[PDB]
Amino acid sequence: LERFELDKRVAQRVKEQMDTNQREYYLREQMKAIQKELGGEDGLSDLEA
Amino acid sequence: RLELPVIPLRNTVILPHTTTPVDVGRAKSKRAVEEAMGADRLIFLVAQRDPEVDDPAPDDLYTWGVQAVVKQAMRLPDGTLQVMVEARARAQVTDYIPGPYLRARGEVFSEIFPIDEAVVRVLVEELKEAFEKYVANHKSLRLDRYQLEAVKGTSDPAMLADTIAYHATWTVAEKQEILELTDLEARLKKVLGLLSRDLERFELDKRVAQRVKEQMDTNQREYYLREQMKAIQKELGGEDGLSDLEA
Amino acid sequence: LERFELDKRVAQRVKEQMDTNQREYYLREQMKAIQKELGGEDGLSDLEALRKKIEEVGMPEAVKTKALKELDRLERMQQGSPEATVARTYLDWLTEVPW
Amino acid sequence: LERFELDKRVAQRVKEQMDTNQREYYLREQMKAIQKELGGEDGLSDLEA
């Protein structure tokens, strides 16, 4: 029964690891989407200039 | 003019002519409701000082306010005295004799009256289409959707602004700068501008939601394609990255 | 008509400058929440003290635009680094000298 | 009563040391089977070496 309790415990730790990985991916793409919308006015790059 | 108890608040700003439940959950303040019934059942609602304190003080009010009045005599047996109000009109303070219990020496109401009413007609129909599509857009409001279909037909831009700008969330200092002028049709313009900024931030949210989704689908496509490349190297196999190692 | 419309276009620039820069207020508010949940604190109180100290000391406006082009390469990276700390201390050394 | 209190406490902490053994043992079982399926039985030979 201790073995089964240990299985539930590592099951929950697994699922939480997944969801923080997923949301941190989501939010870095949020950040860069917002970011290039902000830098929308300037589209000129240094090498093209 | 009849001095009235300024009954203290948590965060809620009231506009005139609106039935509103005020939940007096403070034993420093329910006795101010006893003093309100000892003051012709009358209230004078002045805004609580921002970021909140829990003390009725002279350093915990503002420089305007409105009067209200009891509608239900509701007791809650937990330390709260629920009062139903309806705000009258805007006035101010002659002598705020401080507290417990706080009062202001009451005024008469500030009485501004509409001229230039066809611009008000254009701005009421702009308000109408604006609030219409505001309800249609912001579904984070979860609003009652059976009401402006009933109350569209009136022309009372005071009461129109009251009930229309009442139900919807924008912050406390904006409630202040509506509450804190005698200027009428400019504050109607202010409400319309609030609606405009609502629609603006709505559409900017939409835009960055779409940029999110296309970056997601792009990364998934690029992963699928790099696996197509790997497996093509596999089923060519003569081009193994390995017989060079055995050689 | 012509003078009223001069004042009208003045109020047009008033409205659109308020719209645009309160709109960027909204967008940086979103970046506050995002940087919080990913890293530590509100970006460890970064890029807000620098942004409020560029506008207040001095300065010639070419220096100010030069600094605002250096805040934008710290919107792309904050981790580490052997790369972003050089521009960080560069703009620090810029903003701290007197005008 | 006192001597048998001593016996019961020392035996229960014998079971506590057995609980430490069961924790580290069973989790070591799980982690080495996972480390094996991340290996080919090599990556299991050379790391123990």
Side-chain angles (χ1 to χ4, degrees):
Chain A
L1 293 176
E2 173 61 27
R3 298 289 174 86
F4 192 81
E5 174 64 33
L6 201 284
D7 274 332
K8 300 285 104 171
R9 194 174 185 177
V10 294
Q12 288 304 112
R13 190 70 47 79
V14 163
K15 186 174 77 175
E16 300 303 326
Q17 285 282 325
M18 287 179 191
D19 288 330
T20 66
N21 291 319
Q22 178 177 3
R23 191 173 179 84
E24 260 66 1
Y25 166 67
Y26 178 86
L27 292 185
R28 279 184 297 273
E29 301 298 329
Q30 278 281 327
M31 177 181 69
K32 302 307 286 184
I34 287 295
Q35 181 71 54
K36 69 182 182 180
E37 291 296 320
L38 191 63
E41 312 99 9
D42 295 350
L44 184 59
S45 65
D46 195 2
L47 298 177
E48 184 66 29
Chain B
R1 284 182 184 268
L2 189 61
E3 55 184 0
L4 300 184
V6 175
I7 298 172
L9 293 179
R10 275 81 62 198
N11 55 0
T12 304
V13 181
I14 309 297
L15 278 79
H17 302 88
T18 298
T19 302
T20 304
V22 173
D23 301 334
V24 183
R26 295 159 68 183
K28 294 181 286 184
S29 307
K30 298 184 290 182
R31 292 178 288 112
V33 179
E34 302 175 0
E35 293 291 329
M37 282 189 181
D40 200 75
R41 295 182 68 192
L42 287 173
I43 310 167
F44 185 62
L45 290 173
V46 178
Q48 173 52 252
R49 185 63 49 82
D50 292 332
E52 290 182 358
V53 304
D54 54 352
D55 195 359
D59 298 331
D60 285 324
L61 290 181
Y62 279 93
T63 65
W64 277 96
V66 294
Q67 294 187 0
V69 65
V70 180
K71 303 299 180 187
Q72 69 175 357
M74 179 67 77
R75 175 62 181 168
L76 295 172
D78 58 350
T80 307
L81 184 61
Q82 178 176 0
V83 60
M84 190 69 71
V85 303
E86 187 179 2
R88 294 185 180 275
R90 61 187 63 92
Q92 278 189 353
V93 180
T94 292
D95 194 0
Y96 59 105
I97 300 169
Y101 62 96
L102 266 82
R103 297 177 78 97
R105 182 163 289 176
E107 285 183 347
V108 299
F109 302 112
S110 297
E111 297 177 355
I112 193 68
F113 288 101
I115 311 168
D116 191 0
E117 295 176 354
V119 172
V120 173
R121 288 197 290 269
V122 178
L123 203 62
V124 159
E125 64 185 0
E126 281 185 351
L127 175 59
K128 200 67 66 180
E129 298 178 356
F131 178 73
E132 185 178 3
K133 63 186 70 175
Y134 168 66
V135 173
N137 285 123
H138 282 87
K139 292 180 172 64
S140 66
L141 269 293
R142 295 286 89 190
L143 191 58
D144 291 331
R145 295 171 182 86
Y146 62 95
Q147 294 173 353
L148 194 273
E149 294 180 352
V151 297
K152 184 175 75 174
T154 64
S155 177
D156 190 3
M159 185 269 174
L160 288 171
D162 291 330
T163 304
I164 289 165
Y166 177 71
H167 303 298
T169 295
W170 55 87
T171 186
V172 177
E174 303 172 357
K175 299 291 191 294
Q176 296 302 110
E177 299 180 357
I178 293 170
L179 185 273
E180 287 165 350
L181 286 175
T182 316
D183 198 358
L184 182 64
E185 281 79 5
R187 93 178 81 199
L188 298 175
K189 291 184 183 291
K190 180 70 174 175
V191 172
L192 267 293
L194 289 157
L195 299 179
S196 70
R197 300 294 291 168
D198 290 332
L199 292 174
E200 181 71 25
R201 183 62 168 174
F202 187 81
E203 295 296 324
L204 188 60
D205 194 3
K206 187 189 270 82
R207 183 173 300 120
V208 296
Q210 292 306 106
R211 292 292 190 270
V212 163
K213 186 190 287 186
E214 287 112 24
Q215 279 179 351
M216 301 305 172
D217 294 332
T218 297
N219 294 312
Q220 170 59 252
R221 176 63 172 172
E222 185 164 355
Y223 175 69
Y224 188 89
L225 291 167
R226 79 181 73 252
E227 296 298 321
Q228 294 278 103
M229 187 173 177
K230 278 177 62 182
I232 286 304
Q233 295 297 325
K234 289 295 186 294
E235 288 182 350
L236 262 66
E239 297 70 22
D240 218 45
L242 219 88
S243 179
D244 187 71
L245 293 181
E246 284 94 8
Chain C
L1 280 169
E2 296 180 356
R3 190 178 65 249
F4 267 110
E5 283 177 350
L6 180 63
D7 292 330
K8 189 180 266 80
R9 286 188 293 272
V10 167
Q12 190 75 43
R13 268 79 55 89
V14 168
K15 283 181 68 67
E16 293 175 353
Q17 191 62 247
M18 289 194 289
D19 285 333
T20 301
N21 286 324
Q22 292 182 358
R23 200 185 66 181
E24 280 196 357
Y25 167 71
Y26 272 102
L27 283 181
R28 291 193 297 274
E29 182 173 0
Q30 186 174 358
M31 188 172 284
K32 293 171 190 172
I34 286 174
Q35 179 60 45
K36 175 71 171 178
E37 184 169 357
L38 302 190
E41 297 180 4
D42 195 9
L44 218 71
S45 301
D46 289 345
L47 296 181
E48 56 88 18
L50 297 168
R51 294 183 181 277
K52 72 179 175 65
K53 78 185 288 186
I54 289 164
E55 57 89 21
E56 66 192 1
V57 298
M59 61 172 67
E61 66 273 13
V63 187
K64 188 181 288 184
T65 58
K66 182 73 174 178
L68 293 175
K69 297 298 187 293
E70 295 291 325
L71 288 174
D72 295 333
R73 69 178 64 249
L74 288 178
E75 297 294 329
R76 293 182 183 174
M77 58 181 177
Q78 288 179 355
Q79 74 275 16
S81 66
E83 182 67 27
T85 60
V86 177
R88 177 67 179 273
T89 58
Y90 170 73
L91 64 92
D92 289 330
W93 185 267
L94 190 147
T95 55
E96 64 193 355
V97 299
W99 289 269
Chain D
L1 282 171
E2 292 178 355
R3 185 71 179 271
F4 293 162
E5 285 180 359
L6 178 62
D7 287 331
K8 288 180 285 187
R9 292 177 298 170
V10 172
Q12 187 56 255
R13 292 176 289 178
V14 164
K15 288 185 283 186
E16 289 181 353
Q17 192 69 35
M18 292 299 288
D19 287 326
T20 305
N21 194 1
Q22 285 172 355
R23 281 188 63 95
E24 204 272 331
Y25 178 72
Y26 185 67
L27 289 168
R28 183 64 63 187
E29 290 287 330
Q30 291 287 319
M31 185 180 290
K32 295 301 285 186
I34 296 307
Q35 206 265 119
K36 178 179 178 180
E37 288 189 356
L38 267 302
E41 206 254 3
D42 22 273
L44 203 62
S45 178
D46 54 355
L47 293 180
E48 293 177 354

mmCIF file with all atom_site columns, all heavy atoms in Angstrom, chain A residues 25-26 29-30 32-34 36-37, chain B residues 204 207-209 211-212 215-216 219:
data_model
loop_
_atom_site.group_PDB
_atom_site.id
_atom_site.type_symbol
_atom_site.label_atom_id
_atom_site.label_alt_id
_atom_site.label_comp_id
_atom_site.label_asym_id
_atom_site.label_entity_id
_atom_site.label_seq_id
_atom_site.pdbx_PDB_ins_code
_atom_site.Cartn_x
_atom_site.Cartn_y
_atom_site.Cartn_z
_atom_site.occupancy
_atom_site.B_iso_or_equiv
_atom_site.pdbx_formal_charge
_atom_site.auth_seq_id
_atom_site.auth_comp_id
_atom_site.auth_asym_id
_atom_site.auth_atom_id
_atom_site.pdbx_PDB_model_num
ATOM 1   N N   . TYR A 1 25  ? 6.355  27.696 -22.266 1.00 0.00 ? 25  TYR A N   1
ATOM 2   C CA  . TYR A 1 25  ? 6.441  27.842 -23.719 1.00 0.00 ? 25  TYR A CA  1
ATOM 3   C C   . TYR A 1 25  ? 5.436  28.864 -24.249 1.00 0.00 ? 25  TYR A C   1
ATOM 4   O O   . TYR A 1 25  ? 5.805  29.778 -25.012 1.00 0.00 ? 25  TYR A O   1
ATOM 5   C CB  . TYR A 1 25  ? 6.230  26.481 -24.360 1.00 0.00 ? 25  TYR A CB  1
ATOM 6   C CG  . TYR A 1 25  ? 5.951  26.499 -25.833 1.00 0.00 ? 25  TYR A CG  1
ATOM 7   C CD1 . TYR A 1 25  ? 6.916  26.892 -26.736 1.00 0.00 ? 25  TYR A CD1 1
ATOM 8   C CD2 . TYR A 1 25  ? 4.728  26.052 -26.320 1.00 0.00 ? 25  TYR A CD2 1
ATOM 9   C CE1 . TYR A 1 25  ? 6.660  26.879 -28.074 1.00 0.00 ? 25  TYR A CE1 1
ATOM 10  C CE2 . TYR A 1 25  ? 4.473  26.020 -27.647 1.00 0.00 ? 25  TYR A CE2 1
ATOM 11  C CZ  . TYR A 1 25  ? 5.440  26.439 -28.521 1.00 0.00 ? 25  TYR A CZ  1
ATOM 12  O OH  . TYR A 1 25  ? 5.187  26.423 -29.865 1.00 0.00 ? 25  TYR A OH  1
ATOM 13  N N   . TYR A 1 26  ? 4.172  28.730 -23.821 1.00 0.00 ? 26  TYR A N   1
ATOM 14  C CA  . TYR A 1 26  ? 3.096  29.633 -24.231 1.00 0.00 ? 26  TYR A CA  1
ATOM 15  C C   . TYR A 1 26  ? 3.416  31.083 -23.917 1.00 0.00 ? 26  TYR A C   1
ATOM 16  O O   . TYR A 1 26  ? 3.164  31.980 -24.726 1.00 0.00 ? 26  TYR A O   1
ATOM 17  C CB  . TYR A 1 26  ? 1.828  29.214 -23.506 1.00 0.00 ? 26  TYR A CB  1
ATOM 18  C CG  . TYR A 1 26  ? 0.585  30.024 -23.740 1.00 0.00 ? 26  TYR A CG  1
ATOM 19  C CD1 . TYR A 1 26  ? -0.240 29.761 -24.810 1.00 0.00 ? 26  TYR A CD1 1
ATOM 20  C CD2 . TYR A 1 26  ? 0.215  31.017 -22.854 1.00 0.00 ? 26  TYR A CD2 1
ATOM 21  C CE1 . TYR A 1 26  ? -1.387 30.471 -25.004 1.00 0.00 ? 26  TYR A CE1 1
ATOM 22  C CE2 . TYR A 1 26  ? -0.920 31.734 -23.037 1.00 0.00 ? 26  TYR A CE2 1
ATOM 23  C CZ  . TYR A 1 26  ? -1.721 31.461 -24.117 1.00 0.00 ? 26  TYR A CZ  1
ATOM 24  O OH  . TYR A 1 26  ? -2.873 32.182 -24.314 1.00 0.00 ? 26  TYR A OH  1
ATOM 25  N N   . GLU A 1 29  ? 6.176  32.723 -26.085 1.00 0.00 ? 29  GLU A N   1
ATOM 26  C CA  . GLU A 1 29  ? 5.701  33.147 -27.401 1.00 0.00 ? 29  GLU A CA  1
ATOM 27  C C   . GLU A 1 29  ? 4.757  34.342 -27.301 1.00 0.00 ? 29  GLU A C   1
ATOM 28  O O   . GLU A 1 29  ? 4.741  35.188 -28.201 1.00 0.00 ? 29  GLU A O   1
ATOM 29  C CB  . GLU A 1 29  ? 5.037  31.995 -28.135 1.00 0.00 ? 29  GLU A CB  1
ATOM 30  C CG  . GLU A 1 29  ? 5.952  30.785 -28.347 1.00 0.00 ? 29  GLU A CG  1
ATOM 31  C CD  . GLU A 1 29  ? 7.184  31.061 -29.189 1.00 0.00 ? 29  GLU A CD  1
ATOM 32  O OE1 . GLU A 1 29  ? 7.138  31.927 -30.081 1.00 0.00 ? 29  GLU A OE1 1
ATOM 33  O OE2 . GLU A 1 29  ? 8.207  30.379 -28.964 1.00 0.00 ? 29  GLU A OE2 1
ATOM 34  N N   . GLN A 1 30  ? 3.962  34.416 -26.224 1.00 0.00 ? 30  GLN A N   1
ATOM 35  C CA  . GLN A 1 30  ? 3.223  35.637 -25.891 1.00 0.00 ? 30  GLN A CA  1
ATOM 36  C C   . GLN A 1 30  ? 4.130  36.839 -25.839 1.00 0.00 ? 30  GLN A C   1
ATOM 37  O O   . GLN A 1 30  ? 3.815  37.890 -26.409 1.00 0.00 ? 30  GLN A O   1
ATOM 38  C CB  . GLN A 1 30  ? 2.551  35.503 -24.532 1.00 0.00 ? 30  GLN A CB  1
ATOM 39  C CG  . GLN A 1 30  ? 1.248  34.788 -24.478 1.00 0.00 ? 30  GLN A CG  1
ATOM 40  C CD  . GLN A 1 30  ? 0.156  35.685 -24.934 1.00 0.00 ? 30  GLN A CD  1
ATOM 41  O OE1 . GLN A 1 30  ? 0.228  36.889 -24.717 1.00 0.00 ? 30  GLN A OE1 1
ATOM 42  N NE2 . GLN A 1 30  ? -0.882 35.121 -25.530 1.00 0.00 ? 30  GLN A NE2 1
ATOM 43  N N   . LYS A 1 32  ? 7.168  37.324 -27.157 1.00 0.00 ? 32  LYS A N   1
ATOM 44  C CA  . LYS A 1 32  ? 7.793  37.790 -28.390 1.00 0.00 ? 32  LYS A CA  1
ATOM 45  C C   . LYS A 1 32  ? 6.762  38.274 -29.405 1.00 0.00 ? 32  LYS A C   1
ATOM 46  O O   . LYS A 1 32  ? 7.069  39.134 -30.238 1.00 0.00 ? 32  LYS A O   1
ATOM 47  C CB  . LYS A 1 32  ? 8.694  36.713 -28.971 1.00 0.00 ? 32  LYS A CB  1
ATOM 48  C CG  . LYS A 1 32  ? 9.766  36.308 -27.989 1.00 0.00 ? 32  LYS A CG  1
ATOM 49  C CD  . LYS A 1 32  ? 10.553 37.510 -27.460 1.00 0.00 ? 32  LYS A CD  1
ATOM 50  C CE  . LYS A 1 32  ? 11.518 38.086 -28.468 1.00 0.00 ? 32  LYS A CE  1
ATOM 51  N NZ  . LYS A 1 32  ? 12.317 39.178 -27.868 1.00 0.00 ? 32  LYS A NZ  1
ATOM 52  N N   . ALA A 1 33  ? 5.521  37.794 -29.311 1.00 0.00 ? 33  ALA A N   1
ATOM 53  C CA  . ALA A 1 33  ? 4.471  38.297 -30.191 1.00 0.00 ? 33  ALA A CA  1
ATOM 54  C C   . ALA A 1 33  ? 4.118  39.734 -29.856 1.00 0.00 ? 33  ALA A C   1
ATOM 55  O O   . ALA A 1 33  ? 4.103  40.600 -30.744 1.00 0.00 ? 33  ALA A O   1
ATOM 56  C CB  . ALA A 1 33  ? 3.236  37.415 -30.090 1.00 0.00 ? 33  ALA A CB  1
ATOM 57  N N   . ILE A 1 34  ? 3.807  39.988 -28.580 1.00 0.00 ? 34  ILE A N   1
ATOM 58  C CA  . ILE A 1 34  ? 3.724  41.339 -28.029 1.00 0.00 ? 34  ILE A CA  1
ATOM 59  C C   . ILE A 1 34  ? 4.918  42.191 -28.422 1.00 0.00 ? 34  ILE A C   1
ATOM 60  O O   . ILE A 1 34  ? 4.748  43.329 -28.878 1.00 0.00 ? 34  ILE A O   1
ATOM 61  C CB  . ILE A 1 34  ? 3.592  41.236 -26.501 1.00 0.00 ? 34  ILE A CB  1
ATOM 62  C CG1 . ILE A 1 34  ? 2.207  40.738 -26.135 1.00 0.00 ? 34  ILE A CG1 1
ATOM 63  C CG2 . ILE A 1 34  ? 3.925  42.529 -25.810 1.00 0.00 ? 34  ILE A CG2 1
ATOM 64  C CD1 . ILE A 1 34  ? 1.161  41.674 -26.498 1.00 0.00 ? 34  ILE A CD1 1
ATOM 65  N N   . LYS A 1 36  ? 7.232  42.000 -30.947 1.00 0.00 ? 36  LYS A N   1
ATOM 66  C CA  . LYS A 1 36  ? 7.346  42.464 -32.320 1.00 0.00 ? 36  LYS A CA  1
ATOM 67  C C   . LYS A 1 36  ? 6.171  43.335 -32.717 1.00 0.00 ? 36  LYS A C   1
ATOM 68  O O   . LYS A 1 36  ? 6.334  44.187 -33.596 1.00 0.00 ? 36  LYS A O   1
ATOM 69  C CB  . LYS A 1 36  ? 7.513  41.297 -33.291 1.00 0.00 ? 36  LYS A CB  1
ATOM 70  C CG  . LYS A 1 36  ? 6.316  40.390 -33.474 1.00 0.00 ? 36  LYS A CG  1
ATOM 71  C CD  . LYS A 1 36  ? 6.693  39.265 -34.421 1.00 0.00 ? 36  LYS A CD  1
ATOM 72  C CE  . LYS A 1 36  ? 5.552  38.320 -34.707 1.00 0.00 ? 36  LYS A CE  1
ATOM 73  N NZ  . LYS A 1 36  ? 6.004  37.247 -35.636 1.00 0.00 ? 36  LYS A NZ  1
ATOM 74  N N   . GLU A 1 37  ? 5.018  43.204 -32.045 1.00 0.00 ? 37  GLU A N   1
ATOM 75  C CA  . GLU A 1 37  ? 3.957  44.179 -32.282 1.00 0.00 ? 37  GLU A CA  1
ATOM 76  C C   . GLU A 1 37  ? 4.363  45.547 -31.778 1.00 0.00 ? 37  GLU A C   1
ATOM 77  O O   . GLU A 1 37  ? 4.066  46.560 -32.414 1.00 0.00 ? 37  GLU A O   1
ATOM 78  C CB  . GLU A 1 37  ? 2.645  43.748 -31.636 1.00 0.00 ? 37  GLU A CB  1
ATOM 79  C CG  . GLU A 1 37  ? 2.050  42.557 -32.314 1.00 0.00 ? 37  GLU A CG  1
ATOM 80  C CD  . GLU A 1 37  ? 1.674  42.839 -33.734 1.00 0.00 ? 37  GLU A CD  1
ATOM 81  O OE1 . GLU A 1 37  ? 1.152  43.936 -34.003 1.00 0.00 ? 37  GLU A OE1 1
ATOM 82  O OE2 . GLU A 1 37  ? 1.938  41.973 -34.590 1.00 0.00 ? 37  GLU A OE2 1
ATOM 83  N N   . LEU B 2 204 ? -6.663 44.723 -29.739 1.00 0.00 ? 204 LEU B N   1
ATOM 84  C CA  . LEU B 2 204 ? -5.238 44.439 -29.633 1.00 0.00 ? 204 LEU B CA  1
ATOM 85  C C   . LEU B 2 204 ? -5.002 43.066 -29.010 1.00 0.00 ? 204 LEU B C   1
ATOM 86  O O   . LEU B 2 204 ? -4.068 42.347 -29.411 1.00 0.00 ? 204 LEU B O   1
ATOM 87  C CB  . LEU B 2 204 ? -4.543 45.542 -28.845 1.00 0.00 ? 204 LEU B CB  1
ATOM 88  C CG  . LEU B 2 204 ? -3.024 45.500 -28.791 1.00 0.00 ? 204 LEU B CG  1
ATOM 89  C CD1 . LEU B 2 204 ? -2.495 45.591 -30.156 1.00 0.00 ? 204 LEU B CD1 1
ATOM 90  C CD2 . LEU B 2 204 ? -2.540 46.675 -28.035 1.00 0.00 ? 204 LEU B CD2 1
ATOM 91  N N   . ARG B 2 207 ? -5.458 40.612 -31.828 1.00 0.00 ? 207 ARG B N   1
ATOM 92  C CA  . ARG B 2 207 ? -4.325 40.586 -32.739 1.00 0.00 ? 207 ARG B CA  1
ATOM 93  C C   . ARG B 2 207 ? -3.193 39.742 -32.191 1.00 0.00 ? 207 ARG B C   1
ATOM 94  O O   . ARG B 2 207 ? -2.624 38.903 -32.910 1.00 0.00 ? 207 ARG B O   1
ATOM 95  C CB  . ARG B 2 207 ? -3.840 42.004 -33.001 1.00 0.00 ? 207 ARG B CB  1
ATOM 96  C CG  . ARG B 2 207 ? -2.717 42.092 -33.988 1.00 0.00 ? 207 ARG B CG  1
ATOM 97  C CD  . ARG B 2 207 ? -2.416 43.536 -34.318 1.00 0.00 ? 207 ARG B CD  1
ATOM 98  N NE  . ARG B 2 207 ? -3.586 44.174 -34.899 1.00 0.00 ? 207 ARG B NE  1
ATOM 99  C CZ  . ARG B 2 207 ? -4.196 45.225 -34.373 1.00 0.00 ? 207 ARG B CZ  1
ATOM 100 N NH1 . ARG B 2 207 ? -3.725 45.778 -33.274 1.00 0.00 ? 207 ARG B NH1 1
ATOM 101 N NH2 . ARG B 2 207 ? -5.265 45.736 -34.956 1.00 0.00 ? 207 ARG B NH2 1
ATOM 102 N N   . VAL B 2 208 ? -2.885 39.897 -30.907 1.00 0.00 ? 208 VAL B N   1
ATOM 103 C CA  . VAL B 2 208 ? -1.738 39.151 -30.403 1.00 0.00 ? 208 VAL B CA  1
ATOM 104 C C   . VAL B 2 208 ? -2.111 37.703 -30.145 1.00 0.00 ? 208 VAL B C   1
ATOM 105 O O   . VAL B 2 208 ? -1.243 36.821 -30.178 1.00 0.00 ? 208 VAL B O   1
ATOM 106 C CB  . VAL B 2 208 ? -1.138 39.834 -29.170 1.00 0.00 ? 208 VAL B CB  1
ATOM 107 C CG1 . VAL B 2 208 ? -0.621 41.173 -29.589 1.00 0.00 ? 208 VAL B CG1 1
ATOM 108 C CG2 . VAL B 2 208 ? -2.174 39.980 -28.103 1.00 0.00 ? 208 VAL B CG2 1
ATOM 109 N N   . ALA B 2 209 ? -3.409 37.418 -29.982 1.00 0.00 ? 209 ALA B N   1
ATOM 110 C CA  . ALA B 2 209 ? -3.852 36.027 -29.954 1.00 0.00 ? 209 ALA B CA  1
ATOM 111 C C   . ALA B 2 209 ? -3.600 35.336 -31.291 1.00 0.00 ? 209 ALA B C   1
ATOM 112 O O   . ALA B 2 209 ? -3.145 34.179 -31.336 1.00 0.00 ? 209 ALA B O   1
ATOM 113 C CB  . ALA B 2 209 ? -5.330 35.955 -29.588 1.00 0.00 ? 209 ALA B CB  1
ATOM 114 N N   . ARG B 2 211 ? -1.254 36.225 -33.514 1.00 0.00 ? 211 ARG B N   1
ATOM 115 C CA  . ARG B 2 211 ? 0.187  36.067 -33.715 1.00 0.00 ? 211 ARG B CA  1
ATOM 116 C C   . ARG B 2 211 ? 0.746  34.902 -32.908 1.00 0.00 ? 211 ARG B C   1
ATOM 117 O O   . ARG B 2 211 ? 1.641  34.173 -33.380 1.00 0.00 ? 211 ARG B O   1
ATOM 118 C CB  . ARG B 2 211 ? 0.912  37.338 -33.346 1.00 0.00 ? 211 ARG B CB  1
ATOM 119 C CG  . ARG B 2 211 ? 0.631  38.454 -34.274 1.00 0.00 ? 211 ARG B CG  1
ATOM 120 C CD  . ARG B 2 211 ? 1.229  38.154 -35.597 1.00 0.00 ? 211 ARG B CD  1
ATOM 121 N NE  . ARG B 2 211 ? 1.191  39.319 -36.467 1.00 0.00 ? 211 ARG B NE  1
ATOM 122 C CZ  . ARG B 2 211 ? 0.190  39.604 -37.285 1.00 0.00 ? 211 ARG B CZ  1
ATOM 123 N NH1 . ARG B 2 211 ? -0.866 38.813 -37.339 1.00 0.00 ? 211 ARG B NH1 1
ATOM 124 N NH2 . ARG B 2 211 ? 0.244  40.682 -38.044 1.00 0.00 ? 211 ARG B NH2 1
ATOM 125 N N   . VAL B 2 212 ? 0.183  34.679 -31.716 1.00 0.00 ? 212 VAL B N   1
ATOM 126 C CA  . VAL B 2 212 ? 0.486  33.477 -30.942 1.00 0.00 ? 212 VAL B CA  1
ATOM 127 C C   . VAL B 2 212 ? 0.177  32.224 -31.746 1.00 0.00 ? 212 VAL B C   1
ATOM 128 O O   . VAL B 2 212 ? 1.047  31.361 -31.921 1.00 0.00 ? 212 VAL B O   1
ATOM 129 C CB  . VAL B 2 212 ? -0.279 33.494 -29.609 1.00 0.00 ? 212 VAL B CB  1
ATOM 130 C CG1 . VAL B 2 212 ? -0.310 32.120 -28.986 1.00 0.00 ? 212 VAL B CG1 1
ATOM 131 C CG2 . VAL B 2 212 ? 0.400  34.434 -28.645 1.00 0.00 ? 212 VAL B CG2 1
ATOM 132 N N   . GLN B 2 215 ? 2.514  31.456 -34.666 1.00 0.00 ? 215 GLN B N   1
ATOM 133 C CA  . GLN B 2 215 ? 3.835  30.967 -34.264 1.00 0.00 ? 215 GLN B CA  1
ATOM 134 C C   . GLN B 2 215 ? 3.782  29.524 -33.773 1.00 0.00 ? 215 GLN B C   1
ATOM 135 O O   . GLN B 2 215 ? 4.719  28.743 -34.013 1.00 0.00 ? 215 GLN B O   1
ATOM 136 C CB  . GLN B 2 215 ? 4.447  31.867 -33.207 1.00 0.00 ? 215 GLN B CB  1
ATOM 137 C CG  . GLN B 2 215 ? 5.082  33.088 -33.767 1.00 0.00 ? 215 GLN B CG  1
ATOM 138 C CD  . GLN B 2 215 ? 5.657  33.966 -32.691 1.00 0.00 ? 215 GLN B CD  1
ATOM 139 O OE1 . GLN B 2 215 ? 5.432  33.745 -31.511 1.00 0.00 ? 215 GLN B OE1 1
ATOM 140 N NE2 . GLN B 2 215 ? 6.436  34.958 -33.094 1.00 0.00 ? 215 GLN B NE2 1
ATOM 141 N N   . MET B 2 216 ? 2.666  29.132 -33.146 1.00 0.00 ? 216 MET B N   1
ATOM 142 C CA  . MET B 2 216 ? 2.518  27.746 -32.695 1.00 0.00 ? 216 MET B CA  1
ATOM 143 C C   . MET B 2 216 ? 2.467  26.787 -33.874 1.00 0.00 ? 216 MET B C   1
ATOM 144 O O   . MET B 2 216 ? 3.206  25.788 -33.919 1.00 0.00 ? 216 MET B O   1
ATOM 145 C CB  . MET B 2 216 ? 1.255  27.574 -31.860 1.00 0.00 ? 216 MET B CB  1
ATOM 146 C CG  . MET B 2 216 ? 1.192  28.427 -30.640 1.00 0.00 ? 216 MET B CG  1
ATOM 147 S SD  . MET B 2 216 ? 2.613  28.215 -29.592 1.00 0.00 ? 216 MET B SD  1
ATOM 148 C CE  . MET B 2 216 ? 2.324  29.516 -28.415 1.00 0.00 ? 216 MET B CE  1
ATOM 149 N N   . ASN B 2 219 ? 5.863  26.422 -35.627 1.00 0.00 ? 219 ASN B N   1
ATOM 150 C CA  . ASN B 2 219 ? 6.857  25.570 -34.981 1.00 0.00 ? 219 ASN B CA  1
ATOM 151 C C   . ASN B 2 219 ? 6.520  24.093 -35.132 1.00 0.00 ? 219 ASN B C   1
ATOM 152 O O   . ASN B 2 219 ? 7.415  23.265 -35.365 1.00 0.00 ? 219 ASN B O   1
ATOM 153 C CB  . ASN B 2 219 ? 6.962  25.948 -33.520 1.00 0.00 ? 219 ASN B CB  1
ATOM 154 C CG  . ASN B 2 219 ? 7.503  27.325 -33.341 1.00 0.00 ? 219 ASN B CG  1
ATOM 155 O OD1 . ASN B 2 219 ? 8.514  27.681 -33.944 1.00 0.00 ? 219 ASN B OD1 1
ATOM 156 N ND2 . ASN B 2 219 ? 6.803  28.141 -32.565 1.00 0.00 ? 219 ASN B ND2 1
#
